[PDB]
Design a protein around this ligand. Sequence first.
Ligand SMILES: [Zn+2]
Ligand SMILES: [Zn+2]
Ligand SMILES: [Zn+2]
Ligand SMILES: [Zn+2]
Ligand SMILES: [Zn+2]
Ligand SMILES: [Zn+2]
Lengths: 288, 285, 285
Amino acid sequence: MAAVLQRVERLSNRVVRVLGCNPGPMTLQGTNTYLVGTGPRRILIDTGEPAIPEYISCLKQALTEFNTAIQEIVVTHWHRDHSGGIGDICKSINNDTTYCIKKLPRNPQREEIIGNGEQQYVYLKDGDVIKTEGATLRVLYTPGHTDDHMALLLEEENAIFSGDCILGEGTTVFEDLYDYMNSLKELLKIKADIIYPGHGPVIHNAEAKIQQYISHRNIREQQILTLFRENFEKSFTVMELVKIIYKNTPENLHEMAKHNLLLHLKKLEKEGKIFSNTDPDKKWKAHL
Amino acid sequence: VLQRVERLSNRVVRVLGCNPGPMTLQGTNTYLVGTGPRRILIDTGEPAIPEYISCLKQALTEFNTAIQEIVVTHWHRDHSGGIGDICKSINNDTTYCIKKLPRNPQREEIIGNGEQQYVYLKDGDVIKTEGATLRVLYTPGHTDDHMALLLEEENAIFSGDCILGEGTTVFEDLYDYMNSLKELLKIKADIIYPGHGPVIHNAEAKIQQYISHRNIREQQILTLFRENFEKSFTVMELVKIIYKNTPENLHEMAKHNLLLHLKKLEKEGKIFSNTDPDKKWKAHL
Amino acid sequence: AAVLQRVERLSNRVVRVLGCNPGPMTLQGTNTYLVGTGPRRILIDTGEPAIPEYISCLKQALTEFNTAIQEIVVTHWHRDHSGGIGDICKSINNDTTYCIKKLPRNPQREEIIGNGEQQYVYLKDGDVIKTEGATLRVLYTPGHTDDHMALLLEEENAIFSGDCILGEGTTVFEDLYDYMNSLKELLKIKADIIYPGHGPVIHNAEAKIQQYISHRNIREQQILTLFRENFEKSFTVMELVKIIYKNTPENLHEMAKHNLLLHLKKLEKEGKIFSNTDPKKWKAH
Ligand SMILES: [Zn+2]
Ligand SMILES: [Zn+2]
Ligand SMILES: [Zn+2]
Ligand SMILES: [Zn+2]
Ligand SMILES: [Zn+2]
Ligand SMILES: [Zn+2]
């Protein structure tokens, strides 16, 4: 049932997609790296995984086929399927000048090493604009997936490069559900026409997908709150909650359920709906 | 010469990491524990060894089984390095659950691309599979996160790099290392499945060999200090005296070994150091 | 640009093995050197990680010049100089494990070699590394990196400059103040030859170091003149780039902005210019 994506493909007058050639459980058909612009120098969004020689061949084929070169490299987040190929591109895709690699900083800030260590990131900020011939990209800070997660708005198409915030097929993972839901709510306000995700096919129904993503998490949150508000006098452990909430989940997915539940509890805790205690087996309980 | 895929018992299959080297001997010993269609995998080899993934696929096909979960002894890249490779190459219905002890003090530990996370265990935790029960044994010394596992059905220890099947191992803290060896002795295990080298059938004799080896050198160092209790010694003074029968090409190994021994005796309040630019060591009393 | 052959005897004491890692920052590749005249020699730098071609070249060099590795000396932490450590240990067979020497990071940091079981032996400025037919004095040259080590081959009056001085073109650095100071220190050595980390051999050492000093000093004079002429004015990084880097194209704006900031941090450290706490403007002092 998963779509078979081609290694090099012209998606629009301004976007060309090169597959990372790194399929897997977390990357789907591979990392979707994009060449944005209409001129002889284009912006490269993401670089795939480290040491994938097939991607360098595909990237060289796209640049030759579309008679273009890399202007600069923009990385959505630190995950190695988006930032791993930076060193490989610098060494293999010959250029007059060294490449400029832009990214959002880590939150809190951290030293991030590129290649051998002589190359450094140029850090951007929310609302920054990246310009090329025929394309203007506005930087949209979308934390949740990662603390440095950057989505980009292609103004000329009203298109979003969502990175790993929104995927072309299936759902995604995140570190913080509170920031993730807030980023989805912010992307909704852009009212974008198309989403170019970090993995999976192109999304033509942006509003419906983001709303599907919000509803999926909200239904589970409503289930968890109902349990707490119906049993206000009980302090529940994670194991207690997992057995009640994820009753329709098999035992082989216990650790995934436990992890999902904790992401939901940290969101409700941050919102002040539930409080935890300092017990060795941490207990959660409804307040007020 | 260890063969790459081998059934060691009714519950254990050894898959070699295909990463031989000075520190890994013939390669990392990874083990498939259990008797059912889903087994526990202990250690994963090094990063980017495609030969190991082929050997692991051969074992799973040969023994008509699959991975239930992955258990990592310690953070060293010959033990935790192949996780990303297994997740990408050994196809499964669900993503793998990777279990390990936390770092001490705690640290962020990145698996693969960064989207996979460790499920952290604690000392005494039990990992169950069809036909096998593994008790988690915290054995620090080699590393601050080192885990040994007790296979209850065989009274067997998966020692990781705490105990090797040939020669000795390295460690960070001699005090914790010696304490872990003393703890493993109390288990009174029948067999040891080490992280490198062949299987150990006389567990008691091997752990006692490891303890005695370190204790002989500690006794030599302590005797020098307690006999010359009014004297203070520099590291270079002590290396020339203690490691007299060791060649000059092994000087840095000797100096390193001595310092590991001196930090244990210092922790034990048997010796004390001073604030001199060339640090001097004297017996306590 | 000169075409360097992979294995070459440059001296009665020095033999160079190319890293087989050409690129924008490494030129024709990392220059790794075998120093000494005996059956055991010192290896300066190890190339990049996972370059199988380099291990073949290194094995050819050791066979051709009937020698072996005594110890490994790393100029700095950059992966094109410390990357091949694990590959050499695994592939170039030896009786004992290799001793890998380096200067510490400043401030100190955990530095992982290979799988994690190997550790660096840290040196200090002025330390001497001896082999049959060669004596190397450790020269702490920070600037390029905070751990950067240059070495003086006493018999030849030669400098293994690492990434401080390159055979062709310019180099990059983290701190211009320390970099300029290290170049001034290397000038005092009055070396005959310079064996760089990348590029061909430097036969006119004085002229090369003075070319490297003059290149940075011309730009510093340009910046300082702008500040001293407009002593009442305060400038931002964007204001200063547009004025100073007038002869730099818009495609190199981020490189210019980065270069400028390295120059401003040196002048700030020297108390020639001062910054403010504005959401940032530099003014004369
Ligand atoms: Zn991704
Ligand atoms: Zn991601
Ligand atoms: Zn090991
Ligand atoms: Zn180990
Ligand atoms: Zn360097
Ligand atoms: Zn270099």
